[PDB]
Every structure is written in structure tokens, then in C-alpha cells.
Design a protein around this ligand. Structure first.
Ligand SMILES: [Cl-]
Ligand SMILES: [Cl-]
Lengths: 343, 347
């Protein structure tokens, strides 16, 4: 069994990590680092609460550390964990600096331990449905790929920083690294203080990718819109696993990851037909991390992939601030590794 | 020739002259299409048995009985013929494109003012059912303050002057009419269809101080897009289908007739409750362009489409192309006096 020490029982720790981990056999959430034992124990009566994060990442019976503490503590605790010989999963952001990311990637390899980042959206119902239609050949060669994370919250780190990672990760998994990145980021809600509108375009040799998210969309947009030379596919509603976790649904239960919002496909005749959307399950992230730790498969989300996401994320910000199209700040070897990994 | 009418010479009886101008003009009282310049009399006479056909454009434009010249000849002839018409003391309406470059456009504007004649450009999409509908919802205050305005021109033609230059103009013109001039323009233009040799995908963003405008053109959209998508802090509105006047004209429907400009595709509005309700889309009618030009010529009102507004569209059009090539956000190349006219023109 793999003994886990979850570091931090704040929103993310309690709402995402604990429930997912607890629902995955082969993993054992035995320790939780938190200054508030009662909060942890009312939910997890059988876990051991360790007050100090540093003490937690270095505990004897701990095999894997899941860092869900404040952003600024991710990099430090990760270093401490790897040096203590533990495997590590870091909740986004990996780090607040790419140089640190590279140092952590380097450290993990030196220490021969697994290092991964919580890019948990590769198994969403919407995404899986779209990837399926694309691989089916239904739309021919993809020329326009649009992905939205929109909602209506007129009542007032930023939307791009929070939602951009999901959008980017999915795009890189499907198409690999883009040639350039053009970004337009703004704060449009009256009185808001951080961006709530992000429109990012990723340029590829033969197609375009549009990543968009906004806090001001009462209705009318689609989670996914993809156009190819043989047809188009639209997925209206976004994967509802996050809303399920928010509601307290137990991961892996009957309606977990179910999506009754079908994929709408338009063929060359401009007519549409529906195609059932496959169920999603972000538990896959932990199931695969589990298998990787058992030597059954390679790390499902190697750290260089998280570095690639940061590169695009930061490139988009530079573009928005400078008004200039940007390239990715990745070394040739990193690009080589990412390219080869892309199968 | 009747003296109480605005006597027009339509220059060119090609696709646009025959499908758009002749039918529209003939449907507007007070206007009289008396001359048509074309090298093919029979082709003209087949539709307009009683109009006078003049072989050369120059002779038609300079005819003393002509009050207004409508230029619908090849693109390269627009600037020179407009120049000749103005110098001949005639009023002029130029089919898009106004001119091929901005300096000539500016020269024509100056010339029309010197010759004290009306000069306009055929930006005929300001009276489309979809646009009028969207404008109505915005002005109603239904969406609260507009934050994201998206306008599309998409079709599905996998089998192959560029998409941006052809369709970008009406998309831009509508945006400027609604919001005035943007602070900056960002563009991404490409050729994506297999075998295509001209851009068939254009994604342009107009940046305003408190909101964004997205104009999108593509030849590869089998389905899924909306003509207009507008989000405000109080709600959203989507207009799925495009105005049908063009299709009606192509089908030979008489402008101003029974079903002219009708649009039974409603505006779909989403309020803060996230629920949608429909709103009847107003009838569209591009005959308004000529009715207003008519009224302007009779001195009743100002030019409905002053040349400086066409110059503004050209500025945005070119700025998008520069941005697309340089990868750099662009500002518009308009003078302070042009901006003043445009700012107070937008009030
Ligand atoms: Cl992610
Ligand atoms: Cl137009």
C-alpha cells in the first residue's frame, strides 16, 4: 500500500485531494498536515493529523506527499519531501517560478523519486468526448479548436492563472507544443481587481487553438467547439465533476463523472446528430500515479509536462502585457523530451 | 427625363450592379435609374428594357443629366471613376472597396468637400435584421454594460481578395457604429483549408477601454457558430442565423416586397437567472441606405455614411493585417481631425 501524507486541509485539500485519494484503492491517506485537527478529523476520523508541514513531509511511514498548502510553500515543501526520499504530487501551481520548477525536476531525478503536478483534467467527460470524435475522423483534419471555461458571476491570482492550466494542458496533450502564443487578458467586471476575461490563441503549423475563460457569460457559449474540413463538433456543457465535488458527491459513486449532455456533430451536409459523451473520472490521475509508483507504468504526468504548461501560461501573460506574440521559454532538450513523450 | 428625381447612372452591370444596386435603387421613390454604363447593352436591356445604356464609364459619369453616380465596376476603377465623377460635379456612391489605399481615400474625401458634393461608400449592412436586433437589445439596457461583443461570418466550403478583406468590412463597420473607434487592434489571419491560396480564417480583436470586440471569419464551419454573441454584466444575447436579404436578392426577390428582410430567427436572451427567452428580431432593409442617401441629397439630413467612416473601416482592416504579420498589437492610422469627426460623430 502507498501511504500518503496530504499537506494542507484547506479548500483544495479537503474538496479535491482527500475525497479522490480516499476513493482510490491501493492508496492510503494516513496523515494530514494541518494546524486544525478538529476540521480534519470530523471528515477523516481515522487519519493522523500532524501540525507541522515540514514534519509531515519527513514522516517515516510516508511514501507519497501530496502538497495542497499555500502557493508559495509548494516549491519549498517539495524540495524537503524529495530530499526526505518521498514521492511528490504538487497541487497547482507547480511553483511560482520556472527556474524552481526545473530545479525540482532535477532534484527528483537525482533522488530517483516520482514528481508530478495535479493536472487532473485529462479525463473529463467533455474532453474525452471531444478527443474521441477527433480520433474517429468524423471531422477530418482539425483546423479550429476552441475551448471555453465560462460562467456568470457579476458579483465581485486571476482567472487565467486559475483556469488557464486546465485549458492549456488539454490542448498540449492533443496537439503538442504550439509555435507561438498570443494572449489578451483583462479585468472587465466593474470593480474587479484581477483578470476575469482571458482570450488566448495558440498557433500551430496547420490549425488554430483558442483558449477562453470569462466570469461574465450568462449563456450562449460552448465548452468545446471544434471545426475540421469534414465537419464540426460542439460540446455545450462542461464536465460536472468539480460541481459534484463541491456538492460533496463521493468520487467513484453511481453518478460520478456522468455527462448526459451529448456531443453535437455537424457533417458536410450541415446537419447535426448527437453522440453520447463518455463518462469522466479524474480519479484516473491518482490511479495512474498509484500504478506508476508500483512500477507498472511511467509517471502519468511527468514534471516536464507541467513545465510546458507554465511556459504557455507565462507566454500568454507576456503577450497580453507587451502586446506581442510570444514563443515558449523551453530549452531544446526540454522541447526534445516533450516532443518524444508526445509519443 | 423627369426633373424632380435624383437621376442616377449605375456604373457597371456585373454581379453587384445587377443583383444589388439596380433592384434596391428602383425600389426607392425619388430615385431614378436612368443610365447604366456597360459594354453589353442586351444584358442590361434584358432586365431594364427602358434604361439608357452608355458604353463607356467616363461618358456615363460625365453626362449632364446625371445627378448621382453609383460605382459598381471593377475594384481598380473605383478610385479613378469616383475622382472623375466628383470633378464632374456629380454626387458619388462607391461600392466596396472605397479605394485601394488610404491616401487615395483621403484624397477623395478632400475632393468631395472641395467640390461640395456628397460622397459615400456602400456599407449596406447597418440595416440587417441580425444587427438591428442585437443593437436593439444592447440599447434597451437588457444586457447591462456590454463587455464581450462577438460577430461572425462563417460558412462551410472545404473545397477550394481574401476572406478578411471581403467580409471583414461589414463586421468592422457594425462594431464601429456601435462602439466608436477601438484603442488597439490585434489580428490573426491564416490559410487553413487544404489547397487554399488565400486566407480563409480571420480572427480579429478590437480592444476598447472597458470591453472587447471579436470579429471572426472562416470558410470551414460545418455548424455550431452564431452570427452574434454578446455578453454584458446583466445578461447575454445570441443571434444564431444571419440576415437573409442577400439570399433573397440572389433569388430575385423584389426589395421592399412582402417577405423582404423578414427574420423569423429570434434573439435568444439570457438574464442573470441563466434562463433564456426569445425576442422577435426586427425586419432588415438595406433600402434604407438609398432612402437616407436620397434624403441627404434633398438636404433633409446628413450623409448617412460619410466617407470618413469608410476610412475608419479601412484603418481597422489594415491594422488587423499589420498585427497579423508583425505579431504586434496595432493602433489606427487616422489623424486627429479624422478622429474628432469620428468621436463627435459617434457623439
Ligand atoms: Cl490542470
Ligand atoms: Cl459593409
Amino acid at each position: 500500500t502507498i501511504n500518503i501524507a496530504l499537506i494542507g486541509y484547506g479548500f483544495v485539500g479537503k474538496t479535491f485531494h482527500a475525497p479522490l485519494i480516499r476513493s482510490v484503492p491501493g492508496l492510503n491517506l494516513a496523515f494530514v498536515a494541518s494546524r486544525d485537527e478538529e476540521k480534519v478529523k470530523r471528515d477523516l476520523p481515522d487519519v493522523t493529523v500532524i501540525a507541522s508541514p515540514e514534519a509531515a513531509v519527513q514522516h517515516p511511514d510516508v511514501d507519497l506527499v501530496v502538497i495542497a498548502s499555500p502557493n508559495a510553500t509548494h516549491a519549498p515543501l517539495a524540495r524537503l519531501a524529495l530530499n526526505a526520499g518521498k514521492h511528490v504530487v504538487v497541487d497547482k501551481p507547480f511553483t511560482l517560478d520556472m527556474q524552481e520548477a526545473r530545479e525540482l525536476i532535477a532534484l527528483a531525478e537525482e533522488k530517483q523519486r516520482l514528481l508530478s503536478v495535479f493536472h487532473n483534467r485529462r479525463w473529463d467527460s467533455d474532453y474525452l468526448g471531444i478527443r474521441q470524435v477527433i480520433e474517429q475522423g468524423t471531422l477530418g483534419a482539425v483546423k479550429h479548436f476552441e475551448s471555453h471555461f465560462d460562467r456568470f458571476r457579476p458579483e465581485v491570482s486571476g482567472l487565467w492563472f486559475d483556469l488557464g492550466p486546465h485549458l492549456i494542458d488539454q490542448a498540449l496533450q492533443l496537439f503538442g507544443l504550439p509555435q507561438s502564443v498570443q494572449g489578451n487578458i483583462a479585468t472587465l467586471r466593474d470593480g474587479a481587481e484581477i483578470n476575469d476575461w482571458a482570450h488566448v490563441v495558440l498557433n500551430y503549423p496547420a490549425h488554430k487553438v483558442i483558449l477562453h475563460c470569462s466570469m461574465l457569460v450568462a449563456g450562449g457559449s460552448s465548452r468545446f467547439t471544434v471545426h475540421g474540413d469534414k465537419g464540426s463538433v460542439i460540446k455545450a456543457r462542461a464536465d460536472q465533476q468539480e460541481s459534484q465535488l463541491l456538492a460533496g458527491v463521493v468520487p467513484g459513486s453511481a453518478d460520478w463523472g456522468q455527462d448526459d449532455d451529448p456531443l453535437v456533430i455537424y457533417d458536410a451536409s450541415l446537419q447535426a446528430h448527437a453522440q453520447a459523451t463518455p463518462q469522466g473520472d479524474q480519479r484516473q490521475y491518482y490511479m495512474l500515479i498509484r500504478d506508476a509508483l508500483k512500477g507498472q507504468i511511467a509517471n502519468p504526468v511527468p514534471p516536464v509536462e507541467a513545465l510546458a504548461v507554465m511556459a504557455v501560461l507565462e507566454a500568454a501573460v507576456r503577450s497580453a502585457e507587451s502586446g506581442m506574440v510570444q514563443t515558449l521559454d523551453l530549452s531544446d532538450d526540454e522541447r526534445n523530451t516533450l516532443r518524444e513523450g508526445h509519443h
